[PDB]
Amino acid sequence: AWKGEVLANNEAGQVTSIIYNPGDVITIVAAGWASYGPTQKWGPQGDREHPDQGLICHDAFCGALVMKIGNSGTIPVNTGLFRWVAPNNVQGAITLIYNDVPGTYGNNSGSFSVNIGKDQS
Amino acid sequence: AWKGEVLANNEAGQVTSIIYNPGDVITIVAAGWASYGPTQKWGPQGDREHPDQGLICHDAFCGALVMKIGNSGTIPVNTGLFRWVAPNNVQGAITLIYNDVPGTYGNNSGSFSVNIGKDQS
Amino acid sequence: AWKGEVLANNEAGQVTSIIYNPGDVITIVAAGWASYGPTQKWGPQGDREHPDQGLICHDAFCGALVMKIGNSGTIPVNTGLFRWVAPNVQGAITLIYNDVPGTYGNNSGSFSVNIGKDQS
Amino acid sequence: AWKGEVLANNEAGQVTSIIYNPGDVITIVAAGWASYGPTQKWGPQGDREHPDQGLICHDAFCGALVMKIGNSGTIPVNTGLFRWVAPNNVQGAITLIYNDVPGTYGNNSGSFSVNIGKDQS
Ligand SMILES: COCCOCCOCCOCCOCCOCCOCCO
Ligand SMILES: O=C(c1cc(O)c(O)c([N+](=O)[O-])c1)c1c(F)cccc1F
Ligand SMILES: O=C(c1cc(O)c(O)c([N+](=O)[O-])c1)c1c(F)cccc1F
Ligand SMILES: O=C(c1cc(O)c(O)c([N+](=O)[O-])c1)c1c(F)cccc1F
Ligand SMILES: O=C(c1cc(O)c(O)c([N+](=O)[O-])c1)c1c(F)cccc1F
Ligand SMILES: [Ca+2]
Ligand SMILES: [Ca+2]
Ligand SMILES: [Ca+2]
Ligand SMILES: [Ca+2]
Ligand SMILES: [Cl-]
Ligand SMILES: [Cl-]
Ligand SMILES: [Cl-]
Numbered sequence A, B, D: 001a002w003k004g005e006v007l008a009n010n011e012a013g014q015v016t017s018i019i020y021n022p023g024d025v026i027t028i029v030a031a032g033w034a035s036y037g038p039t040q041k042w043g044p045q046g047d048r049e050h051p052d053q054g055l056i057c058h059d060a061f062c063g064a065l066v067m068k069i070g071n072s073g074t075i076p077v078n079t080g081l082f083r084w085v086a087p088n089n090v091q092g093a094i095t096l097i098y099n100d101v102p103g104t105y106g107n108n109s110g111s112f113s114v115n116i117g118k119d120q121s
Numbered sequence C: 001a002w003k004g005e006v007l008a009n010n011e012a013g014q015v016t017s018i019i020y021n022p023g024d025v026i027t028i029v030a031a032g033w034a035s036y037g038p039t040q041k042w043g044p045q046g047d048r049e050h051p052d053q054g055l056i057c058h059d060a061f062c063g064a065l066v067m068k069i070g071n072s073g074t075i076p077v078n079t080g081l082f083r084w085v086a087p088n089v090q091g092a093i094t095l096i097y098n099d100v101p102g103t104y105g106n107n108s109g110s111f112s113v114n115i116g117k118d119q120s
């Protein structure tokens, strides 16, 4: 399992030591507070009212936690994933990233704490 | 394992199928949007800015997910618990509850979806 | 989890630390060689050729590994159980060598056993 | 997870659906009765009395269950493995094989039933 933090201001995100392989079942729990600019904070589901003006992940809100598996597209994580299997063929290291518009990360603050483990399969 | 929905307006909470037994390791993942009154909705960590005017759980924010194990006091859950073991001597049915001030649940809205499992031991 | 040895000559069995609770999923792996009397040795499934003349567990061969959960009837284990859920039963697991009561004194050897709770 | 049968007479082994990947923890349980020739049958540890006259796996008895992981050499399984991790540099599909002398599988009988699963990490 892996435990670590992902910074809201980082467009490159945080590479984990978890390698997702076909058939793997994983569990993620994410917590904390961040902002994509305003003087308020949101949890890892982000801000459900904010428009999408070019988010890296169009399937999660602005300020949400998302991931990639290897060189996949972005995949929503939000508060986490319970005994989850990837619905498409993806493989490789999990990278955690804060969902924001590229070029707009400089006014971001805060971080999410994340735990990830492989489950029985 | 258990999956279900906890209503923000349910002051009594939701008794799950899960009986926490001595030695149990559990994982909880909670998602969704709920409000303790405002138009805005929060995630399972609740609203970090709101004052505590008599929440049922003083160790979590207003609008957070919390629980009881048997007849315990409230225990924070938030976005969830990763491979977690309860305090000495706590045991019995898990009850999930929305953290609000007693008497003020009637204006609450939304729900959290929650999964609970037992981990290897 | 629990890891240990179960002695063929112990009629009373081996009380483990595992308290099986309703809904629990467990895995057991058992290995090794034991005898219920002959010079030969058998694995955890016991001796498929020996008749049952009053074994403590009628659902396993003579010389097999079996168990009880709390004060239950005997339940076959053999080489082990994969991600298994018990019938109906609650309490501590006791592992026992399947022999005819009164006939344990000529037994030899032991089985090595791992038990864990799985995800559920 | 994978559940299936390995025929004592199958010199090629039974290829499973399990791809062992670096860092995987697995559990195997094997049961049943097979023979390498005689009328008697043995369990998955095989026949402790039979000499080794050129077994595919010299670290297990004649008639034992063994495996390969990808193009590895043979690794004993016997009655099974409990939360086991492979040597480094071993990866790929698990193939289960009855331990006998090459060229002598044709007088074999019976089979083992085997379960394989990946464990938490
Ligand atoms: C962990 O330390 C906290 C210490 O709390 C002191 C103990 O308070 C016990 C009472 O909790 C009052 C909060 O009631 C909230 C309402 O729940 C309803 C559900 O109930 C189900 C259990 O039958
Ligand atoms: O969604 C955003 C948007 C998102 C941000 O995180 C952010 O920091 C800013 N910003 O401070 O200007 C704009 C946006 C955009 F990227 C282009 C046009 C209009 C916008 F609202
Ligand atoms: O924290 C609350 C408080 C909390 C609520 O969930 C709620 O629905 C209300 N309400 O709508 O009146 C007040 C509170 C209180 F309990 C007393 C005085 C002032 C408050 F804000
Ligand atoms: O199954 C057994 C049986 C089993 C034993 O392990 C053992 O040690 C003995 N014994 O030494 O008498 C008999 C048995 C029996 F109980 C009565 C008659 C014939 C038997 F083989
Ligand atoms: O161990 C074996 C051996 C093992 C077998 O399973 C088998 O079927 C036979 N066989 O029938 O030839 C020989 C062996 C050998 F390989 C050479 C000489 C003597 C042996 F028993
Ligand atoms: Ca921003
Ligand atoms: Ca309220
Ligand atoms: Ca005996
Ligand atoms: Ca043969
Ligand atoms: Cl980061
Ligand atoms: Cl939240
Ligand atoms: Cl805080």
Ligand SMILES: [Cl-]
Pocket: A022, A023, D017, D018, D019, D020
């Ligand atoms: Cl696989």
Ligand SMILES: [Cl-]
Pocket: C042, C043, C044, C045, D042, D043, D044, D045, D046, D079
């Ligand atoms: Cl055996």
